[PDB]
Amino acid sequence: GAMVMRLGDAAELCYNLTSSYLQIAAESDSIIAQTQRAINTTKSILINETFPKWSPLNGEISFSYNGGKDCQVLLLLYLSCLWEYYIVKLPTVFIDHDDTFKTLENFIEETSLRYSLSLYESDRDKCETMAEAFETFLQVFPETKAIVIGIRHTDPFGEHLKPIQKTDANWPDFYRLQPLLHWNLANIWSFLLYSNEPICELYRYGFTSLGNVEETLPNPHLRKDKNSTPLKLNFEWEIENRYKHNEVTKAEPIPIADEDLVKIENLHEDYYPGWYLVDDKLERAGRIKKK
Template sequence: MCNAFYAAKVCHDLVQSFLASSPTSSLYSLKSTFDKDNNSVLKLHNKLQLPTLYPSSFNATLHESAQTQVQKSYNDFLSVLSHWDLEQLSISYNGGKDCLVQLIIYLAAIYQFIEVDRKGTQKEPNTIHVNAVYVHTENEFEDQLRFLEKSVLQYGLDFTAVYTTIDVNDSASSQILRGEANDSSQGRITCLFSPTPTLPCGFLTYLKSKESVKAIVVGIRRTDPYGATLKLEQKTDTHRGWPDFMRINPILEWHTSDVWYFIKWLQHTSSNSDFAIDYCSLYNDGYTSLGGCGNTVRNPQLKRKDSKEKNVLFWPAWWILDDDIERLSRVQKGKV
């Protein structure tokens, strides 16, 4: 388990390093073929049978685009922190790529606001309390759940998992996340059970357990369903049965290419540190948008043959970066 303060400091240093980096040192320019380095990134990419260390799209133009998106989201978070107390905020986190990006930037902004700008308040020195939540409405893949569990502890979150389809008495279910902590500054997992199997009821269950929370950070983008008309801060639709809270949407303008470039840059930069940034392994297997087991498949647009033209493989999610094909990993329930 990790102290949230330390995680926020590491994320802050990584974000500042990325923003200060030159587009001319893009990931693709670092190494176009495998030859010398023997690090974890190289081993992973070799295992995936990729022709080059990074795709040609990971160039200076994309580096600069991702920097622009990171800076905007970072500034938006600082603005949010200026009028919401940290205890009033929570972040929706399911271990997916979009949630991971916004979590890292959120932690970086918290450290900037509290430690660098000295604008926040802390009960004790070198402590940060970060609320997080995930409302489970489907049966997730085992790999996603294990990454979620691991990363919640790594980033030191006070995390609540709300189950809408699992009975409170089914404690043996593999879907139930595990986690313990000695104090609130370390990663902690609490499990709650919604009385009815709906997303709004799941959030209501959470808000009743965390009465201080008034706003929740959500990782939706413009290209996602229902994302086209959203603003940075927007109230829930209480007339449609949602509980009353403010939704914070800090990555609305991001594209899939920005998300993956930033994640892979973080992975590359932190690979030899004691706080290595990772992501759910399902993305390496051709899944581009993670839902439940019953409506998620490997993206058919990423299908390929191996080097001997015999076995069917899939490009990793970050190898072909197109918003239009990203959600082809999702299908109607019952048709997987």
């Protein structure tokens, strides 16, 4: 049971859950309303600024997908916008690394099958920079004009970015399409939880940012401790009223890899899941101390 949707069914599903989220009753100072506003901005960037210029059907656009929560939100929104643009397999690139979490590798494969992506992966056993990996990608796919990237302004290297922006001089020449820049961490959790799509299950165990296996720990701000003030959940409504699937769209979480559970159990500590963190400044706090 692999939870596979043909691309059109995936796009329609994403349109429907996004539309459903936009119909949620919320007040003007809520996280849900802020997320609705962020969705509307993303939709305008894609439908008004992107698709009229570059074709998402003929290989002009590739989607950079790394399995993390930001890329996943953006992929759901991108699929929704394809459906909206055209009605109302997908070329995908993953820059792989030798120090990626196994659960994340598993999740990228599972989602490629779920959403009918056409996945290209760079070679994890080659020592090369991201720019170099993308140069090789462009040799394989020379028709590529633009690449969708799921970065936010609060991420490292996120400050000096715009929604439509040519690449750096040492990259292959393409336009970066960056439609998620204005999203905040709380918006990411709200939408992802409401969507009821499978997500990388490391977040369930207290990770808030999936860096590499050597540096990344569950977030210490989420550690359970009798003598801390208990954390409160900001996403109760979304979780309790999450989007209901049907026979075609039915899915399930996939458990973390055996090796990742061993690493988490060896900590002898328990954590709230990642969606108990809403401060963007602390997203990357779960990290081995280095000199």
